[PDB]
Each structure stands twice: as C-alpha cells, then as structure tokens.
Amino acid sequence: GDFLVHHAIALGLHTTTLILVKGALDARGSKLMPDKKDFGYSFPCDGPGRGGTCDISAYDAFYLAVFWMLNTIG
Amino acid sequence: QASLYTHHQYIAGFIMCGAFAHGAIFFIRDYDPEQNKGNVLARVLDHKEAIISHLSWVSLFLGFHTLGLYVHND
Amino acid sequence: AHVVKIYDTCIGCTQCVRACPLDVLEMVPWDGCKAAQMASSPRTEDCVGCKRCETACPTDFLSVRVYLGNESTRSLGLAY
Amino acid sequence: VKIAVDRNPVETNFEKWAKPGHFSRALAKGPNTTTWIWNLHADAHDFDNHTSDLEEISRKVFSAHFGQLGIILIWLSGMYFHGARFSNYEGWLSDPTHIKPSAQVVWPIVGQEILNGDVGGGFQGIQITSGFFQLWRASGITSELQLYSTAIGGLVLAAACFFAGWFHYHKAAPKLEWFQNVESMLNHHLAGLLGLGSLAWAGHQIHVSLPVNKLLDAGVDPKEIPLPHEFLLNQSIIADLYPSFSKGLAPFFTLNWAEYSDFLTFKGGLNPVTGGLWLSDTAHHHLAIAVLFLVAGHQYRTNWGIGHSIKDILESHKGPFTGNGHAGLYEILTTSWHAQLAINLALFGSLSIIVAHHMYAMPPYPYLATDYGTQLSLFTHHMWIGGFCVVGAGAHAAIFMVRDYDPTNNYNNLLDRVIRHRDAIISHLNWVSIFLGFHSFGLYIHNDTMSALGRPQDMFSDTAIQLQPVFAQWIQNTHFTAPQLTAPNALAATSLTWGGDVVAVGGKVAMMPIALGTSDFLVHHIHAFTIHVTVLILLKGVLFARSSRLIPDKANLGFRFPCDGPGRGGTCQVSAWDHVFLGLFWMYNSLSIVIFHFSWKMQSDVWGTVTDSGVSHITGGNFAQSANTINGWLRDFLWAQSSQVIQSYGSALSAYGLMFLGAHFVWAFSLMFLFSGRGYWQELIESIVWAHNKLRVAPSIQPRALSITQGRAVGVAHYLLGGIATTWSFFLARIIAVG
Amino acid sequence: MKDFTTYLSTAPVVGLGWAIFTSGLLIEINRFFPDPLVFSF
Amino acid sequence: MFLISWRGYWQELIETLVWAHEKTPLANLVYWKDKPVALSIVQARLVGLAHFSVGYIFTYAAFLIASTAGRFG
Amino acid sequence: DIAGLTPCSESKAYNKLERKELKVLDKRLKQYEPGSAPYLALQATKERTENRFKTYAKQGLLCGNDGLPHLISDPGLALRFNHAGEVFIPTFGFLYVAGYIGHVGRQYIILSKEDAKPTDKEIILDVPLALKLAFQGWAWPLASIQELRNGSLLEKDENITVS
Amino acid sequence: KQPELDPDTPSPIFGGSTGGLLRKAQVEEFYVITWESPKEQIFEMPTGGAAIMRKGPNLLKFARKEQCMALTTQLRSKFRQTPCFYRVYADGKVQYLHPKDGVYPEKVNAGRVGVNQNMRSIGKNVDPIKVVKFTGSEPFEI
Ligand code: CLA
Ligand SMILES: CC1=C(/C=C/C(C)=C\C=C\C(C)=C\C=C\C=C(C)\C=C\C=C(C)\C=C\C2=C(C)CCCC2(C)C)C(C)(C)CCC1
Ligand SMILES: CC1=C(C/C=C(\C)CCC[C@H](C)CCC[C@H](C)CCCC(C)C)C(=O)c2ccccc2C1=O
Ligand SMILES: CC1=C(C/C=C(\C)CCC[C@H](C)CCC[C@H](C)CCCC(C)C)C(=O)c2ccccc2C1=O
Ligand code: SF4
C-alpha cells in the first residue's frame, strides 16, 4: 500500500514541476505569444483573439502550480 | 509531531513554488542573451519543448497507472 | 494610458479601423501595392484596451500590440 | 386553416452525410482544425444558424420532434420488455408487501453477478427504483404474456413515428402557414390531444377498476383473476362486482346522473390496509380533465364565424400605465420557435417540480407508500428535470432576443417598458438577495457560534427561542377544517401530511403528518434565497443581452461568446450564455438543498415502522435540533446517512459506491476546466506537438485546445454530472437499506 | 451504397467497430479464461 | 466563488449598484472616495487562490488537531 | 522468503478469507431451491471462486501478513525464483502491443501526408488501408530498429519552434 | 469645415430608460453626436429602446464614447448617413473628434503625419537589458 501512495506523490510532484517548469521556460516568448517579454510577468491575458488566450501569463501557470502544490502536499 | 511535519511540508511547498516563480521572473525581467550566447542556460531554453513534453509524459504515465490501479482495486 | 504601436509589418487592409469600437487609430500615407495605407495611433486618451483591433489585424505577426498601462475613467469604461 | 405541404423537397440520399457540417457553409469547407469537430457537434441542432429560412427551420423542428418521440417510444418499449422477459413481476404481483421490484439481471463475467440482489420471487437481479411494477399493477396485468405484446405495440408505434418524421421532412414538408396556425395548434393540442386522451384514459380506468380495487386486494392470485376481457364483455360479472352496471346505460342518455356511484366515486384518502389509492377517484379526475380540456379547446374563432381569435384579444388589453400593449406578441410567437420554446420551458419545469411535490405527498399508485425509495427517486428526478427546464427557458429567452427579434414589427410597449427599467430590477433583487443571505444564512452562523460558545439556552431552537412559521400552518389549518366546513361533499383533507391519522402498512407507516418548525422555516428561507439568486442570474443574463451600460454593441457579438476583451479592467462572462452557465450552478445548489431537505424531513419526521406502542421512525427525530445549524447537516444527516454508500461493497449495492467515487472524480475533473484557461494548455499542446514532429507522427488536422466557450461548457457539464451522480448514488444507496 | 460505405468512415465506424471488437475480445477472454492475475510461468 | 465567476459579470452588477446608490432618496450625501469596480482578473484569481490555500490549510489543520488531541488514540 | 513474505499456501489468513467468502456465499445460497436459475448462478460463482483460490497457488506467488497476493515487479527477484510472470513478461506483451499500435498508426498517418487534403482522411479514414496496415505490424521490432538505423524517422530539424 | 456643437437642438421622441446620465456626465464630461437622418424613420437606441426620428439633421448625446461610435457604425450599415462627434470638459470647452479628417478614419484623407509607430519588423525588440528606466511602457523611439 505504500507503493501506490508513493507513486501518487510522484505524480503530484511531477505535475507541479511540469506546471512550474512550463511557466518558467515559456516566459520570454512562446509560440502563441512570441513577444511575451514585453508585457512583464503578471498580466491577465492577451485578449480574446487568436481563438482564445486565457491564463497565458506565467503568473497563471504559477496559479495552477500552487493548486497542484496544495494537492501534492495534501 | 504531525502538526509540525505538515507545517514544514506546506512551508517547503510554498517556498519551492516561490523559487520557481522567481526563476520565471528571471527570464521575464533580468536576462541578457548577448552575454549568454553559448552557456548551459541558453541550451536549456532551446530544448524547452523536449523538457515540457517529457514532464507531460511522466505525469501522464503516473496518473494513468495510479488511477488505474486504484479504480481496479475499488 | 495604453501604449499602442504599429510596426512595419502591415498591408493596409483598413480592417483594424472599421473594427475599433472607439475610433482611436488613423490611416495616413503609406506606399503600398494596391491600397497603400498604414495605421497610426495619434491619440490614446480614449483607448480602453479592449484588444478588438488585434483580433482583426491579419498580419503575421500582428502589426499592432496594445501595451497595457494604467487605468482611468476612459480606460475603465465608467459611465459613473 | 388548411394543410400545405410540398412533395419531395429534399431527395433522400446518403451524400450529405459524407460531408459533415454541410448545414454550416463555414464548416463544410473542411476540418483544418480540431475545433471543427466540436463546432459540428455544437451546431448540428442550431437550425437558425444553418440558414435564415424559417420555413426550413420549422420543418427541421417538426421533424426532430418525431425524432425525439421515436426514442421515447423505444424507451418505453424497452422498459416494458425488460419487465416482460426477465423480472420478478409475477412474484412481486403475488406478494407485493415484501418482495422488491427487480427488472435488470447482469451477466456473469468478472463477478458483476453479485449485483443480482436476492429479491425473491424465485428470481434474482438488480432492484429498480423507477416505479414500473406499481404502475403496471394498476392495469390488471396477471402474467408476463401481456408485456411482450405491449412492448411490440410500442415498438411498432415508434417505427411509425420515425416514419412520420421522415415523411413530413422529405415527402410532406409543410409550410410556415401550417406551422403558424396557433388557432389550430391550440384547439387540437388543448382539445384533441389532451381532452380525447383524458377521456380515453378515464374510460380505461373505469373498466379496469375491477381487479385492483376488489380482486387484487382480496388475496386472489393473478392467475385466479379472470382476464380483463372476461370482465369487460360479460354483463353478469360487472353486475356482480358493481351493482351500478347492467342498468341499461339510461342515466347517461337523459343526463340523469344519479345511479352511477359504484365506479365514479369521490372518497379521498386511503385504507391503512390497502396501501394505495383507488381507481375511481382517478377515473373521475380524468373525466373532469377530459371535459375541461375539451371545452377549453373550443374558445377560438377558426372558420365559421364562431368565437374570437388571439390577435383581437391581444389588441383589446391596454391600460393607463403601459398603453398600447400586446401589440405584436402574436407575431412574437408565430415568428420564432425560440420564443415559443422558452415560453414553454418557463413553466414546464415549474409544473414538473409541482408534479414532484404532488407525488411525494400523494402517491397515485398501489403498494408504493411503503416503498420509501421510489418516492425519493421520482421526486428528485422530476425536480432536477424542472430545474434544467427552467434554466433552459432562461437561456432560450435570450436566444430569442438575440437572433429572432427586432422592435419594429414585433414592437410592444410592454417589452420596451420592461427594458427601460432593466437596471432597477437587478439592483433591487441584488439588495433582496443580500437581505436573504444575511437573514437566512447568517442565522446558521449565529446558531453554530452560540452552540460553540457554551450557551445552548441562547441558540435558536424549538425549545430555547422558537422561530417557526404560522402562515404555512394556517394554510394546513384551512385545509384540515376544509372537510364539512368549507368542503361539505369532501370526506378527507387534501393530504395526510397535516391531518394525523398515522397510516401504516406492515409496520412501515405509509404516511404520517409532517410537522413545520423553526428548521423548516429556515430551510424554506434558504430555498427562497437560492431560487431568487438563480432567477437574478438568469434574468440579468436575458436582459443585458441586446444592450448594456458598458458595451452598447452587444447584439452583434451573438449569443454564445466568452467575453469582449481585457479592456476596461477586464470583461469575462458577459454573454447570456455565461449567465446560463452560472444559473446552472445556482440551480444545482437550490435543487440540491431542496432535495436534501426533502430526504431528511421524510426520514426523520415521516417514515418509520409502527410498533404496538406508536411508531419508531428511522432516525430518532434528529431534524428538530440539527437543521438550525450548518453542522447539524453534517452531524446527523450527511455523516450519519453515508454509511451504506461506503459500506456497500459487500453486497449488490457496490455499484452505488462505485458511481459515488466516480462522480466525485468527475466533479473535481470539472473543477480542472473551471479554474484554468487556454494559454497554458495551448502552449503545453505546442510542446507536445514539438515532441510529435520529431518522429513525424503529428496529425494533419491542427490540434487546438477547446474553445473558451467549450471549456466552460465541459466544466459545467462535468460539474453537474459529478454533483448529480454523487447525490444520486447517496440517495439511492441510503434509501434501499432503510426500506 | 457508395455514399453509405463512405459514411462508414467516421465516429460511427472504427471507434464503434473498433472498441466493439476490443470489448468483445476482452470479455470473451475473461469469460472462457475466468480469473487471470499472473502468467502461466 | 472568486475562481468560477470571473470579472466581466461583476462589472455590470457594480454599475447597477452604483445606479441604485446614486438615486436612493436623501441617501446621496458624502460620496465614496474611490470609484467601485470589479476586482482585476489577476487580482480575482490571486484572491481566489489565496482563499483556496488558506481554507485548505485551516480545514486540514483543524482536522489534524481536533481528531488527534481529543481522543488520544 | 523474499521481503518477509511467505508462499501463499501457508497463509492462515488466506485460507480464513477463502472460508469467509464461502460462508458469505452459502448463507444466501441456501435461499433458493436446487432447480431454479439463481441457485445455478450461485453454484457457478462458487465454482470459479474455488477455482480462483486453487489456481493462484501454483509456481509460487507471495502473500504477506494480510494473506493477499503481492506482485513482485523487480527483474532479478522474479529471476533466481519462479516469479517471471508476476510482472516481467506482461511488460513485454504490452510493449509489443503498444509498439504494434504506434507503428501502424504512424505508418498510416505518414502515408496519408502525400495526397491532397489529408485532413479528410483523419475524419473519413481509409478503412482498407487501415486494415492492411493492421495485418502488417506484427514484425514491428524488426522494422523499427532498422528504420532507425535507416534514418527515415528523424526529422532534420525543420519544425516550428519559438525559444 | 468641421462643424461645432450647437445647443438648443431638438431631440427624437422617446420615453426614457436607465442607462448613463449619471454624476459623471455633470462634473466630468459628456459626448455629443449629430447626423442627418432624412425620411423620418425608426431606430434603436444603444442604451434604451426603439424611437422615431424626424427628417433633417438631429442631435443626440450619451455618456461613453463607444455609445456613439456604435450609432455611427449602424448608420454606415443600413443607409448612408454621416454623423459627427463632440467632446465636453468641465470648463465647458468643446473639442471635435470624429471625424477630424471628415472622411471616416478608416479612409485616408489627403495628407497628415501620424505618431506612435516605428519601422521595425514584428518582434526583434530590445531585451530587458538597458531598459531599466522602463518609462512605463516604452515607445522604443522618442
Ligand atoms: C480530479 C480532478 C482532476 C483530474 C482528474 C485531473 C487530471 C489531470 N490533470 Mg489537472 N487540475 C485540476 C484537477 C484535475 N486534474 C484542477 C482543479 C486544477 C486547477 C484548476 C488542475 C490543473 C492542472 C494543470 C496545470 C495540469 C493538469 C494536468 C492533468 C493531467 C495530467 C495527466 C497525468 O498525469 O496522467 C493522467 C491523468 C488522468 C486524470 C487520466 C485519467 C482519465 C481517465 C483515463 C478517464 C478515462 C475515461 C474512459 C476511458 C472513457 C470516458 C470518456 C467518455 C466515455 C465519457 C491529468 C489528465 C497537467 C497535464 O495536462 O498533463 C500534461 C497539467 O499541467 N491539471
Ligand atoms: C551522500 C549520500 C547520498 C548521495 C546523494 C547525492 C550525491 C545526490 C543528490 C541530489 C540532488 C542534487 C538533489 C536535488 C535537488 C534539487 C533541487 C530541489 C533543484 C532546484 C532548482 C530550481 C528550483 C530552479 C529554479 C530556477 C528556475 C525555476 C529557472 C531560472 C533558474 C532558477 C535556478 C532560478 C544518498 C542520499 C543518495 C545516500 C546517502 C549518502
Ligand atoms: C485540459 C483542458 C483543455 C484541453 C481539453 C482537451 C484537450 C479535450 C480533448 C480530450 C478529448 C476527449 C480527446 C479525445 C479524442 C481522441 C483523440 C479520439 C477519440 C477516441 C475514440 C476511441 C472515440 C481545455 O481546452 C480547457 C479550456 C478551458 C479551460 C480549461 C481547459 C482544460 O483544462
Ligand atoms: C463578488 C465578486 C466581485 C465583487 C466583490 C466585491 C465588490 C467585494 C470586494 C470589496 C468589498 C468591500 C470587500 C469587503 C472587505 C473584504 C471582505 C475584506 C477586505 C480586507 C482588506 C482591507 C485586506 C468581483 O469583483 C469579482 C471579480 C472577479 C471574479 C469574481 C468576482 C466576484 O465573485
Ligand atoms: S489591421 Fe493590421 S494589417 Fe490591417 S491596416 Fe491595421 S495594422 Fe495594418
């Protein structure tokens, strides 16, 4: 029974680290928003254009990664 | 015992999330790729898609199999 | 207010003006192929930052980008 | 009024299937993005989005109606055939008191056969809480050989229904002149479809009241009971059973209705031994309904200068304040199908919930009052259906206002007057919701605080300080004294929920009067609060759809859009679609609170087993001093009643716990969508696509994340799915182990 | 007939034909072979 | 509450409340010092996650303390 | 003896659990006559339950202090013993099937990149082509390794990136 | 010749609504629109209901600027009618905004000089180095 729970903890850690590393690496510029370095760090979004751009700033990845941090530590 | 353990666990979780947040703030705000033409940080930024994809893969693996074994046992 | 810019990547489709809801930007001389217009932002006291002009701009990459700045009565769309 | 159809309007061919999205020229070009599939699905029924041909739209709707009724009939036939082939209906029929209904038997594969609960009747299977055995017992069915033929008839009718749909779409496609015959549609729905059906069903209940009322309730085995045809034709039989027959059918010709008293009877109530009601009351009710809806469908001028049309009636209704009202509401309805659909769904769900309230306290069937599970199931089912229907009416109101509306020909001073003060209503309802929240929810906070501070004599209680209602009690008093004072010919009251006379069948009390104290007062205020907040959401979505204070050019953006832009501080969830999004959550909240109130009241102060000395309920009357606190709902109701759902793996109820956990899972899964966006997900898909292109295995169709509107749709879908499924599993695993 | 066979390449085909084949195969293997949890050797 | 419902919805309701507050008879005395608007989207999700985290923490801590220091077993 | 676990025949808890299950089955099996259908159903269920408990205890699978079976997943502990089937060969079987699937899907999606409007082929599949490729992938380990040495699977860095 | 605002102008026949016209319109600003409207007709208001409109130039006014650009665009949509805008400050000073060129900013007028623009390919901007000043949002050329 410790096997399963250690693997659940590994899932939580890898997912939180995924969210954080993704928010960090796609910071200077991503393929959807190439000039992300111009709007700083914590901006709401880049507008409803281009099929929808919601929670695209790295601050939002940190948002979701804090959700997963709560889950993993729980 | 349990109170202090959970205390330090959530403290460490928030501190790690903050570490990653400031790591992203670095790329956003304080970065000079001119000085960094050829270092390991530029290399890490260059294959970022591979890092993100393998994190996604390990997460998918863990989630799939953990939830599958739990649902199977249930 | 909202710092609006227009880069040289433009074709003068006259669409980001017939789409702007606040009549903020103009189109005055440009040396193009068939239409020959280029957009410009002469005034920003009324621009709210709705990013409706960025949705219609077909340039890749976009010709106009709204640098979000500070808010005011016009920038917050406040009838009060 | 006449008939107007066209011959071969659309040739029958499998070509238009090979091009999905043909109805949307934007989609028919090709799937260059994975959003194409989701738009194909989300727009196939959007008939007014295909083209502005309201004739074709009406034809599509009138065909989809048959398309739905065919599925309805195949569903009923499937229920009847399950009851026929594999079920204990004969065993249940010979002994309804203890044998439980079962009509589903699983296959032995991986141990799922444990679900075949031991229900008796020489047969094992899955217990059903739909209420089909009690409904069939009221039809004189004696053996399984009848349900086969009934299902055969139903399936033939469903096939004919699909045939009629295809016929009126591709061979007899009508015109807008026929669809817009409001006069004909009413006088044939109201008079024919309703009156004729009610009269037929009343005549049925009149000639089927022999077995249920007399033979079935006399220990006579169903095989022993003469078949219904042996009761119908033979006059000696119906003369021995009911003396009012074989007279000569004289009183009905000369209208001297004096001798017909053995089969059209008005009693009210039920015998604490018979368990159920009598068929004579239902027969008289259906004859009243037939006469009423048949006469009501004869109050409109159609052809022969007799009556008055709807347009003149609408024109002859004007007042001082409004002036020139009801100018074009007839055109409002005859123009758009969305207006009619919203108007229907408006009170359709409300009447569904009213049917739930009239069924839980008035079981119109035999041998189901002791069945404490079917009542909860049907009640909660109909209430959730009513909530969904009301939210859908709120949505289709805005839908009408978006596409099919223009205040020039459909102009009405009523609607524009409602629009001209569209903000005072919202502000005052905001204030009223604040009032109710501080005055219906804060009371629970006060009660918890008082119980925690060590002052039980200060907490709100039926013993410390009473806060119970009297108006509902005065209504119950007027209904209780109604017999012999305000209802002379009546025998009993409206319901046994306020008239004592504890009726019990086999230990289990079939019905006991329901009390109303401070707890019910508080819970009804919570219900009013939630319902008012839901109505606020829906109406503020409907009104602020054509125009608003922030964005005037709001009608051109359509009905289904997420926002306008991050300008003016931020615009999110501004469309009426998003208001329906939030109204779904609020309807969930309200209906859940109401159903929990129902369940816990019924289990604490109503249901139980009667001993020699009084009745011993399920719970020890935990409703009094637990509802006054939020912790009480977790003290004696949620914590206490959840033992079975988590303790049912050892029996045939483990599937209930499985659905329980799975619904929790899908609920949190919905939370995922509800709290996230697309930027993160789109960039993650970008990196995954990078990983793909390295091995050259990516798809030709551009894989994009779900649309913002579709993101919110998936969120709300999984959210309501998880919620309703968890509550279903709970209410359906708890009530089986206590009945 | 031709347009019907063309229609039979969409969701109502493999995705139904598939996963029906697979559910049937797995159920039959678990039916004839009742309860496996480890290989023969 | 702060996570599911987003900003744009609340701007119209705040404008409605402003309409109501400016028209209340004899209640138009000394005004608010700053205009009321809806929380920023960034602010909205920040406060939502703050409530999320703090409620998560308080609930789990109250459980871990009560279910332990009340029974001793 | 590995990990303090004992072979699952010598587990008193395992036999106690089997007896418990059989008693729980028989207590409600005694409700029906030997001729009816439910009785035969319970008889067959008990048959394959006894078969469960008998067939497991062969070639050795360790049950712990709880009496329940415990899978050994380390190669090396499944070797030097008889546990190679717990999870060692199932790994290779799934790898084979997953290869098969990915190989077939990749060769399909590649052979469709050449014709006009390949997107259609992704919503209206080429059923005969899919059937042909479905009956040609059961040698994929051979084709994969030599298609790797070939180089026809490495894209020479001609994709869309942002950095 | 850009026309300036003229008070004492008649208004269209309408009952009332609950949109705009708040304390902001009295002490901060209010916007004005004027347009021809021949062939007395029915129109829709952006912050109300339907109304009638006489022939001959008629003038309206609202609270927010978009509330009038919406009407200008509508007028484009159906029948070719050519309204204008006006601004008002606290001192009563009036400013004419739309259309300054008289040809509807979507179309060029004979010749002007625009600002807030730079001749540079999309992207290729400056990294955060040497941008410590940050001047709010940089024009990148000033
Ligand atoms: C219980 C709720 C829930 C669930 C189930 C998930 C599940 C998942 N999240 Mg998530 N998340 C949640 C809540 C949830 N989240 C919330 C509330 C937030 C904050 C709002 C986040 C924020 C978040 C982020 C930021 C990310 C994720 C990611 C992921 C995925 C990681 C994949 C993985 O690890 O392996 C698999 C996990 C699974 C859940 C698979 C199980 C699903 C099974 C297979 C369903 C099968 C159904 C059956 C076959 C047929 C049903 C279909 C139809 C018939 C009805 C995963 C699918 C990460 C991701 O996308 O991975 C790359 C990602 O970065 N989540
Ligand atoms: C002695 C010993 C040992 C050994 C050990 C080793 C040798 C190892 C290791 C290890 C390690 C070594 C671990 C780790 C950790 C790590 C971490 C934890 C990390 C981190 C990082 C981060 C977090 C980052 C951040 C950032 C970002 C985000 C971006 C930008 C940049 C920066 C940096 C800012 C053992 C115990 C085995 C056993 C006993 C003895
Ligand atoms: C994950 C996620 C997505 C991504 C959603 C996705 C990728 C849905 C895709 C899943 C479907 C089920 C893929 C299935 C299609 C298969 C490739 C083929 C079907 C299988 C056959 C057998 C039928 C959003 O779009 C989103 C939007 C707004 C807020 C939150 C979120 C959000 O959290
Ligand atoms: C209710 C609600 C509002 C409106 C809420 C308002 C206007 C209340 C916030 C201001 C009042 C005055 C809060 C009163 C005091 C607070 C309880 C605590 C303040 C303490 C600070 C001084 C630290 C939003 O603006 C919003 C924005 C984005 C997403 C969701 C929502 C949302 O749900
Ligand atoms: S919309 Fe973009 S491309 Fe078109 S004229 Fe304006 S700036 Fe140029």
DSSP-derived letter for residue G2 is: G
By residue count, chain H amounts to 142
By CB atoms closer than 10 A (0-12, 13-18, 19+), residue D310 is middle
A14 belongs to an annotated ligand binding site: yes
Q: How big is chain F by its Cα radius of gyration, in Å? A: 20
Q: Quick one: tokens of C24? A: 């903020």
Any residues with CB less than 8 A from the CB of F26 and at least 6 apart, and which? none
Look up the domain containing G122 and give its range. Answer: 1-163
Nearest to B25 among A18, A41, A61 (CB): A41
D328 with D410: CB under 8 angstroms? Answer: yes
Q: Quick one: tokens of B59? A: 């997460």
D710 with D38: CB under 8 angstroms? Answer: yes
Any residues with CB less than 8 A from the CB of D303 and at least 6 apart, and which? D1
**B-to-D residue pairs, Cβ atoms closer than 8 angstroms:** 21
Nearest-CA distance A33 → chain H (Å): 11
Suggest the residue from A53, A59, A63 to mutate for an interface test with chain F (most F CBs closer than 10 A): A63
Is G161 at the interface with chain B, CB within 8 A? Answer: yes
Ligand 5, atom nearest to C12 Cα: 5
CB < 8 Å from H in window 5-64 of F: 18-19, 22
CATH number of D669's domain? 1.20.1130.10
Beta bridge partners of D465: D461
C22 with C47: CB under 8 angstroms? Answer: yes
| Tally of domains in chain G | 1
DSSP-derived letter for residue A71 is: H
Nearest to A31 among D680, D683, D711 (CB): D683
Backbone angles phi, psi at D594, to 5 degrees: -65, -40
**CA–CA–CA angle D363, D368, D372 (5° rounding):** 95
Cβ <8 Å between A27 and B63: no
Q: In testing the pocket of ligand 4, which one of F1, F2, F13, F40 has its CB within 8 Å of the most ligand atoms? A: F2
CA H115 to chain centre: 20
Among chain H residues, CA nearest to B25? H128
Ligand 2, atom nearest to B26 Cα: 30
Q: Which residues of D touch B60 (CB under 8 A)?
A: none
Nearest-CA distance H139 → chain B (Å): 18
CB < 8 Å from H in window 7-36 of A: 34-35
Backbone angles phi, psi at A31, to 5 degrees: -70, -35
H86 with H97: CB under 8 angstroms? Answer: yes
DSSP-derived letter for residue D515 is: P
Helix axes D576-601, D372-402, angle to 10 degrees: 160
DSSP-derived letter for residue G69 is: B
Among chain F residues, CA nearest to C77? F11
Closest CA to D65 of D183, D161, D138: D161
CB atoms closer than 10 angstroms to residue D366: 22
B55 CB within 6 A, ligand 1: no
* C-alpha B69 – ligand 3 centre gap (Å): 23
What does the alpha-carbon distance between residue D43 and residue D68 come to, in Å, rounded to a whole number?
18
What does the alpha-carbon distance between residue D264 and residue D260 come to, in Å, rounded to a whole number?
7
Beta bridge partners of C33: none
- Resolution reading in Å: 3.4
CA C63 to chain centre: 9
Q: Quick one: tokens of D403? A: 């596409």
| Tally of domains in chain D | 1
Closest CA to D118 of D646, D651, D644: D651
Q: Quick one: tokens of D420? A: 């001209």
Suggest the residue from G68, G71, G91, G163 to mutate for an interface test with chain B (most B CBs closer than 10 A): G163
* C-alpha C26 – ligand 4 centre gap (Å): 39
By CB atoms closer than 10 A (0-12, 13-18, 19+), residue B68 is exposed
What does the alpha-carbon distance between residue G150 and residue A15 come to, in Å, rounded to a whole number?
36
Domains with residue ranges and CATH for chain H: 1-142 (3.30.1470.10)
Q: Do chains D and H touch (3 or more CB pairs under 8 A)?
A: yes
Strand-pair category, D173-174 with D5-6: antiparallel
Tell me, letter by letter, the H, E, C secondary structure of G10-67: CCHHHHHHHHHHHHHHHHHHCCCCCCCHHHHHHHHHHHHHHHHHHHHCCCCCEECCCC
- Distance separating the N- and C-terminal Cα atoms of chain G: 54
Beta bridge partners of D616: D609
Is G163 at the interface with chain D, CB within 8 A? Answer: no
The count of C-alpha atoms lying within 13 angstroms of the C-alpha of D28, restricted to the half-sphere facing its C-beta, is: 11
Cβ <8 Å between D540 and F4: no
CATH number of G47's domain? 1.10.8.110
H52 with H40: CB under 8 angstroms? Answer: yes
D673 CB within 6 A, ligand 3: yes
Among chain G residues, CA nearest to A32? G162
Closest CA to D725 of D649, D643, D665: D665
Residue G107 CA: distances (Å) to CA of D76, F37, G147:
47, 57, 12
By residue count, chain F amounts to 73
Letter for the amino acid at E24?
A: G
**CA–CA–CA angle G93, G97, G99 (5° rounding):** 115
Render D256-325 in DSSP notation, one character per residue.
-TTS--SSS----S--TTT-S--HHHHHHHHHHHHHHHHHHTT-S--SSS-S--HHHHHHT---SSS-S-
Closest CA to D515 of D622, D401, D624: D624
Q: Specify the 3-state DSSP secondary structure of G147.
A: helix
The H-or-E segment that residue H31 falls in is strand H31-35
Beta bridge partners of D615: D610
The H-or-E segment that residue C26 falls in is strand C26-29
Suggest the residue from E38, E39, E41 to mutate for an interface test with chain G (most G CBs closer than 10 A): E38
What does the alpha-carbon distance between residue D280 and residue D686 come to, in Å, rounded to a whole number?
70
Ligand nearest to the CA of A7: 1
A24 with B20: CB under 8 angstroms? Answer: yes
Any residues with CB less than 8 A from the CB of D106 and at least 6 apart, and which? D112, D113, D115, D116, D125, D126
H141 with H117: CB under 8 angstroms? Answer: no
Q: Specify the 3-state DSSP secondary structure of D691.
A: helix
What does the alpha-carbon distance between residue D35 and residue D288 come to, in Å, rounded to a whole number?
54
Q: Specify the 3-state DSSP secondary structure of F49.
A: helix
Cβ <8 Å between A60 and D678: no
Cβ <8 Å between D15 and E3: yes
Letter for the amino acid at D128?
A: I
* C-alpha A14 – ligand 3 centre gap (Å): 21
Suggest the residue from F46, F52, F54, F64 to mutate for an interface test with chain B (most B CBs closer than 10 A): F64
Q: How big is chain B by its Cα radius of gyration, in Å? A: 19
Q: Quick one: tokens of C32? A: 């193009």
The H-or-E segment that residue D6 falls in is strand D5-6
The H-or-E segment that residue D125 falls in is strand D124-127
What does the alpha-carbon distance between residue H58 and residue H46 come to, in Å, rounded to a whole number?
16
Residue nearest to atom 19 of ligand 2 (CA): B16
Letter for the amino acid at D648?
A: S
Annotated binding site of D: 3, 17, 22, 41, 45, 60, 65, 68, 75, 82, 104, 107, 112, 129-130, 168-170, 178, 184, 187-189, 201, 205, 207, 235, 257, 284-286, 298, 302, 307-308, 316-317, 322, 326, 344, 358, 365, 381-382, 396, 417, 421, 428, 431, 433, 439, 446, 455, 471-472, 476, 479, 486, 489, 494, 524-525, 532, 560, 563, 572, 577, 586, 664, 672, 680-681, 692, 710, 718, 728
Q: Cis peptide leading into H99, omega within 30 of 0?
A: yes
Q: From its phi and psi, is residue D324 left (phi > 0), alpha (psi between -120 and 50) or beta?
A: left
Closest CA to H32 of H74, H95, H81, H103: H95
Domains with residue ranges and CATH for chain E: 1-41 (1.20.5.510)
Number of continuous H segments (helices) and E segments (strands) in chain B:
3, 0
The H-or-E segment that residue G6 falls in is strand G6-7
Quick one: CA dihedral D381, D509, D527, D733, positive or negative? Answer: negative
Domains with residue ranges and CATH for chain C: 1-80 (3.30.70.20)
The H-or-E segment that residue B15 falls in is helix B2-29
User: E strands within D538-694?
Assistant: 608-610, 615-617
CB atoms closer than 10 angstroms to residue D340: 18
Q: Which residues of H touch D552 (CB under 8 A)?
A: 46-47, 64, 66-67, 70
Beta bridge partners of C38: C28
Quick one: CA dihedral D419, D424, D427, D429, positive or negative? Answer: negative
Alpha helices in E1-41 (DSSP H): 2-7, 17-32
Look up the domain containing D580 and give its range. Answer: 1-739
D365 with D135: CB under 8 angstroms? Answer: yes
Letter for the amino acid at A61?
A: A
Any residues with CB less than 8 A from the CB of D211 and at least 6 apart, and which? D140, D142, D225, D228, D231
CB atoms closer than 10 angstroms to residue B73: 8
Ligand 3, atom nearest to E11 Cα: 23
Q: In testing the pocket of ligand 5, which one of C8, C11, C26, C34 has its CB within 8 Å of the most ligand atoms? A: C11
D171 with D10: CB under 8 angstroms? Answer: no
Closest CA to D118 of G25, A49, H81, A24: G25
Any residues with CB less than 8 A from the CB of D318 and at least 6 apart, and which? D324, D325, D326
Q: Specify the 3-state DSSP secondary structure of D458.
A: helix
What does the alpha-carbon distance between residue H46 and residue H54 come to, in Å, rounded to a whole number?
18
Residue D627 CA: distances (Å) to CA of D110, D438, D462, D589, E8:
44, 17, 11, 17, 58
CB atoms closer than 10 angstroms to residue D468: 15
CA D108 to chain centre: 35
Ligand 4, atom nearest to F11 Cα: 25
Any residues with CB less than 8 A from the CB of G19 and at least 6 apart, and which? none
DSSP-derived letter for residue D490 is: -
Q: Quick one: tokens of B54? A: 């393998």
What does the alpha-carbon distance between residue B50 and residue D557 come to, in Å, rounded to a whole number?
40
DSSP-derived letter for residue D361 is: S
Burial track D367-397 (b if 16+ CB lie within 10 A, e otherwise): bbbbbbbbbbbbbbbbbbbbbbbbbbbbbbb
Helix axes D708-734, D654-675, angle to 10 degrees: 160
Residue nearest to atom 6 of ligand 5 (CA): C16
* C-alpha A59 – ligand 4 centre gap (Å): 21
Token pair 């596409």: residue: D403
CB atoms closer than 10 angstroms to residue D738: 14
C46 with C75: CB under 8 angstroms? Answer: no
Q: Specify the 3-state DSSP secondary structure of D607.
A: coil
Q: Quick one: tokens of D120? A: 């008796």
Q: Quick one: tokens of D394? A: 């709120």
